[PDB]
Design a protein around this ligand. Structure first.
Ligand SMILES: O=C(O)c1ccc(CN2C[C@@H]3C[C@H]2CN3Cc2ccc(Oc3ccc(-c4ncco4)cc3)cc2)cc1
Ligand SMILES: [Yb+3]
Ligand SMILES: [Yb+3]
Ligand SMILES: [Zn+2]
Length: 607
């Protein structure tokens, strides 16, 4: 039972394939077309079925060439409206039928962001992108919007001829639209069964550059050169991921660099990973996000969470694989550095929510909870901490990686729960069950707050970060003159970021210390988004008014939620910038991504 879906469950019927034929209308801000669902009955005498929809206009439903009866139920807030379809003939078990639904999206679809030419790099063409995870696919097309169902898909997308369409699938050609010569049709094929949250579409003035044997980078022309360099390690990361998880089954691994309002660091859309342009640091330092998206090609896209309550399965194992890829490229001391940094991010999330908050549990109950509201570092970091703890308990990384590959092999093309994972862990490590029974499973999986045990971490690379952060925190006015630009000479960008994260955990610091830090280190000149974000939070929480325009500019010139949400919250919490934060949100709201707009509104208590 998936409590986030209003559709018939997988025990009643299952969508085997989607054939999508649609047209993108930038003047109306609508996607119009037909979603033809091949559905297999799982029951005898099946006469109706229910699909998820959200702000969709339904024109008609056709089965066997004839229009059928359908009804839309009352809207259930963020879940949308259930659509019940009356089948013309009762189905026996395993019988399949094709249901062609003619629909139109709303301009306010929570899955989409429609951009004006002014909101793009080129300024001459509009742009469109989707983001279906977790339950936004129902805001694009009628479907069983649950990761417990996997389907293949084909698509034909009509767009203005000057633009390019891409999807989370293999490109299958382009032609002039026969029905309209001012338009082009782009075709797509996804032969690997996927959960519908993995369906994705982008339409814009896109260009491509090859960066590897199975990888193109796509973006507007202005970003192509910088993106090709930034993500040049992609093929090397794919090779390591294949060694760790088994064959890469998806064919292509392309990257799309979105406009700055893209709400996440990345999204693992199969064949076409979507990434934020905030990764463009100029030195490949934020490449762990690519390693993370690559890892999802096994943990999440092949082995999928059965419901959103088990999302930690997707995230925890992916962070685990991501840290092994970066460890293979940069060394074991680096894997430990990132792992320890992750524990710190977990401390921050637990502190923010509170140690008894149900969103700090590894397995959550999302029945009447919007998954976008529950989203945090918890399933990533508490999930990673559990696996890292298990690796240490069970004999080390080589042994635990054997389990990871067997786990991916066992559950490929399936959707699983925490109980399925735990059962297989016990089966694989049957000769180590005495060790496994020492784990406080109830606390790890079902209890809020920090985990009951903290793993062992090598401190080699972290030591210099802690030492410099402690020098600043313990410094008095008479010690400020001792700081100098030479303090940073032996720190990598990763270490500078960690120094800032350690210091931010003890914020606020006195205003004089923050002014001195700018005087000696010139942090205002750093473009790296992670470093700049932590530095600006530190300035605002330490009440430096000079940082107000910089923080406001960062919060609005990009829309990655990891940065935008805490920046607006810190600005609303500083009396000097409170009104500015609220007014800036109000002025930008109508041109923001719909999910980001909703969440920033909730954070600021602005309805
Ligand atoms: O750095 C970054 O900015 C960054 C950000 C994002 C990404 C990738 N994403 C794509 C997008 C966000 C994440 C997953 N997608 C959305 C989503 C998925 C599931 C969900 O439902 C939940 C279920 C359980 C729990 C839960 N809470 C505690 C335990 O379990 C929490 C949410 C809600 C939203 C990569 C990088
Ligand atoms: Yb083909
Ligand atoms: Yb002193
Ligand atoms: Zn992820």
């Amino acid at each position: 039972v998936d409590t986030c879906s209003l559709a018939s469950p997988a025990s009643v019927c299952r969508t085997k394939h989607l054939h999508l034929r649609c047209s993108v209308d930038f003047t109306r801000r609508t996607l119009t077309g037909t979603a033809a669902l091949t559905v297999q009955s799982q029951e005898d005498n099946l006469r109706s079925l229910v699909l998820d929809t959200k702000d969709l206009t339904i024109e008609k439903v056709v089965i066997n060439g004839q229009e059928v009866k359908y009804a839309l139920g009352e809207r259930q807030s963020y879940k949308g409206s259930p659509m019940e379809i009356s089948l013309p003939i009762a189905l026996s078990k395993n019988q399949e039928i094709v249901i062609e639904i003619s629909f139109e999206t709303s301009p306010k679809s929570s899955a989409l962001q429609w951009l004006t030419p002014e909101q793009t790099s080129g300024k001459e063409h509009p742009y469109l992108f989707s983001q279906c995870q977790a339950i936004h696919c129902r805001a694009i097309l009628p479907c069983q919007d649950t990761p417990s169902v996997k389907l293949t898909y084909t698509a034909e997308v009509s767009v203005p001829k000057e633009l390019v369409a891409l999807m989370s699938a293999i490109r299958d050609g382009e032609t002039p639209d026969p029905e309209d010569p001012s338009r082009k049709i782009y075709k797509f094929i996804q032969k690997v069964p996927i959960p519908c949250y993995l369906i994705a579409l982008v339409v814009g003035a896109l260009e491509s550059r090859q960066i590897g044997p199975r990888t193109l980078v796509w973006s507007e022309k202005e970003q192509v050169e910088k993106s090709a360099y930034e993500f040049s390690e992609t093929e090397s990361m794919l090779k390591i991921a294949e060694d760790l998880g088994g064959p890469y089954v998806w064919g292509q691994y392309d990257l799309l660099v979105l406009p700055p309002s893209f709400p996440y660091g990345g999204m693992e859309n199969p064949c076409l990973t979507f990434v934020t342009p905030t990764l463009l640091a100029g030195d490949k330092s934020l490449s762990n996000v690519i390693a993370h998206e690559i890892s999802h090609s096994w943990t999440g896209n092949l082995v999928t969470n059965k419901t959103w309550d088990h999302f930690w399965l997707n995230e925890g194992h992916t962070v685990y694989l991501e840290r092994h890829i970066c460890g293979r490229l940069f060394g074991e001391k680096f894997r430990h550095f990132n792992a320890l940094g992750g524990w710190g991010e977990l401390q921050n999330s637990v502190k923010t929510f509170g140690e008894t908050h149900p969103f700090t549990k590894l397995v959550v109950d999302l029945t009447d909870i919007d998954p976008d509201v529950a989203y945090s570092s918890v399933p990533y970091e508490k999930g990673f901490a559990l696996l890292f703890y298990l690796e240490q308990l069970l004999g080390g990384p080589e042994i635990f990686l054997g389990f990871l590959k067997a786990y991916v092999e066992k559950f490929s093309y399936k959707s699983i729960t925490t109980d399925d994972w735990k059962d297989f862990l016990y089966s694989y490590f049957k000769d180590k069950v005495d060790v496994l029974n020492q784990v406080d499973w109830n606390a790890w999986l079902y209890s809020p707050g920090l985990p009951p045990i903290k793993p062992n971490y090598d401190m080699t690379l972290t030591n210099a970060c802690i030492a410099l952060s402690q020098r600043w925190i313990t410094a008095k006015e008479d010690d400020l003159n001792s700081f100098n630009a030479t303090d940073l000479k032996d720190l990598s960008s990763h270490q500078l970021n960690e120094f800032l994260a350690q210091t931010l955990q003890r914020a606020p610091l006195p205003l004089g210390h923050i002014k001195r830090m700018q005087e000696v280190y010139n942090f205002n000149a750093i473009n790296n988004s992670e470093i700049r974000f932590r530095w600006l939070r530190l300035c605002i929480q330490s009440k430096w008014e000079d940082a107000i325009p910089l923080a406001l500019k960062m919060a609005t010139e990009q829309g990655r939620m990891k940065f935008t949400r805490p920046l607006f919250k810190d600005l609303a919490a500083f009396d000097k910038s409170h009104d500015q934060a609220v007014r800036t949100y109000q002025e930008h709201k109508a041109s923001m991504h719909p999910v980001t707009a909703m969440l920033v509104g909730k954070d600021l208590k602005v309805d």
